[PDB]
Amino acid sequence: KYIEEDIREQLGIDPFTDLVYLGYYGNPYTQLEAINDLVNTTLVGKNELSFKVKVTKPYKEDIKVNLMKEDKLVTDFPEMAEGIPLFPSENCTFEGGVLKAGELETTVKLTLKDVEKLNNLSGYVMAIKLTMEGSHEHLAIARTRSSYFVKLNLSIRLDNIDSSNKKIEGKGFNKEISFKSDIRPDKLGSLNDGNFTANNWYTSNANNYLTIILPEKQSLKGFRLDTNTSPSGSYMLKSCRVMVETPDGNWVNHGVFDRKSMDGIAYISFKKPVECTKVRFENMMAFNGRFSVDVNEVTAFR
Ligand SMILES: [Mg+2]
Ligand SMILES: [Mg+2]
DSSP states (O other): OOOOHHHHHHHHHOTTSEEEEEEOSSSSEEEEEEEEOSSOEEESSOSEEEEEEEESSOOSSOEEEEEEEOTHHHHTOHHHHTTOOBOOGGGEEEEOEEEOTTOSEEEEEEEEOOOTTOOOTTOEEEEEEEEESSOOTTEEEOSSSOEEEEEEEEEEOOSOEEOSOOOOOSOEEOSSOEEEESSOGGGGGGGGSSOSSOOOOBOSSTTOEEEEEEEEEEEEEEEEEEOOOOTTOTBOEEEEEEEEEOTTSOEEEEEEEEOOOOSSEEEEEEEEEEEEEEEEEEEEEETTSOSOBBOOEEEEEO
């Protein structure tokens, strides 16, 4: 059986106390992601955190275990909590667990509720410690592996990208548009030639991007990105993050494009048209799941 080296040392110095502790790989730290649309904060993913609670040897009776918010532990961890507010206690809901007589593991749940108005961009931080309800003989919470740290990272993202893939009803153009990219810059001339079905430019990883540079500030309705027509979805654009450079020079995430219709013409539409100087597509994923997409032609709409 696998036993962690730190609690194996405790069992060596005192083999007459079964230890109850937190089961986790690596460090006791989870960075949760949330997004704000200048109205409400939303968690990216599940709002529940399930923690494994282990006991070193099967115990004679049931052990009730639970987590609690001990904010004092954040003070001795200043690397992550330097000037970051505490996650409010009222927004935590702790569900207990029971290591039933004979069992070696159980789970304890931390549920984050009503985060909507928690809009601090610095994020929030919190510390939690494992506890036992009653008094059990020759049983204790381990010295180490008894506390955990959670950071809620917050970032702005508007819900201004429509992924319906419906044809854009605007006035199309691309002669005056210029393009910049970190990969294959020499092949960007194909993005505004006459050809919609031939490929020259494509991404090779999630860190590649494609920037659309307009001649001047102008209100755009969306874009038509011609992509691959593979039946398997290889190199066919499925999803991407749409960054927009505003007139003051700040870059804002207008949302995630993530279509459900498979074809060679991707229509990325702004729910509310936006005045911008540049638009940058990032984290471009194909329908086959690989981060490599074809862009055969780019057309903007006013
Ligand atoms: Mg159970
Ligand atoms: Mg072309």
